[PDB]
Amino acid sequence: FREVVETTIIEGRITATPKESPNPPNPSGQCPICRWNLKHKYNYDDVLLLSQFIRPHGGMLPRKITGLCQEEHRKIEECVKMAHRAGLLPNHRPRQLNRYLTRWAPGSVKPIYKKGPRWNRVRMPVGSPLLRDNVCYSRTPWKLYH
């Protein structure tokens, strides 16, 4: 990678970089996810993959450098936000209520003071419509709204 220090002299150097694992199983893919056959087989739990795709301080890396396609990039964005909210990344921090699958920012949602009738019920969103299309491994689909 590349690092800059300030001492007033500012200087940048190249540090050691990682490389691919040598033989991808699908070399004809375009995005790294498509190459490594992970098109619908990841969730917000896969912090190994997300830590591969994030910045050291919790932010993300852009598409033109990650090589991801747009759909995969948006899915990784949402997975990373949910992992950050669930607390699965304790070392990628900036500068007690237990959660998981947190879609919205916890400080921006308002309480559902008035649920509607059962035909117009105000539901509580869980998960991601981007992650709607993952492999189910179950005979009932995901329940995106509780």
């Binding site: 033989n23 991808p24 199983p25 056959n37 992970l38 087989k41 990841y42 491994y137």
Partner: protein, 160 residues
């Protein structure tokens, strides 16, 4: 060298249930032969006691053992104190083993013997119909015939 189709260990890569390998039919077949032989020699020597059976009779299935009573809801064209053979035995079992038919057990394998010991009537059942504001009201009293059978014996024979 990763094989074509290798998916890395993620939470949705593999199915959540454990992989089950079934034993191959050849040694499974000889193992079935050994188990059948062991149960058959247990039958021959007689290492069992107080057999029970699940028996299909009169559109029912009854779980009976020896010295039992059952109350069939119809007359059976049989005098009192008459010994008959219950024949449609779905299950016979004991401590340490159990035989299951598909769906009926062989008649050379298990024999259920019962005895008509009572032919009686049920208590009077009331059938009333009422519909309000329509003057609708009917009353009937029925009494179904009934037959008490005593299950005397359940015998199994070595035929496996």
């Amino acid at each position: 060298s990763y094989l074509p189709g290798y998916v890395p260990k993620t939470s949705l890569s593999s199915p959540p249930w454990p992989e089950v390998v079934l034993p191959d039919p050849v040694e499974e077949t000889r193992h079935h032969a050994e188990v059948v032989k062991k149960v058959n020699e247990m039958i021959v020597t007689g290492q069992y006691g107080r057999l029970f059976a699940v028996v299909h009779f009169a559109s029912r299935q009854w779980k009976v053992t020896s010295e039992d009573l059952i109350l069939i809801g119809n007359e059976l064209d049989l005098a009192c104190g008459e010994r008959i053979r219950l024949e449609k035995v779905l299950l016979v079992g004991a401590d340490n083993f159990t035989l299951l038919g598909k769906p009926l057990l062989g008649k050379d394998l298990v024999r259920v013997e019962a005895t008509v010991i009572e032919k009686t009537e049920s208590w009077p059942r009331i059938i009333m119909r009422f519909r309000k504001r329509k003057n609708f009201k009917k009353k009937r009293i029925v009494t179904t015939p009934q037959t008490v059978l005593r299950i005397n014996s359940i015998e199994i024979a070595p035929c496996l």
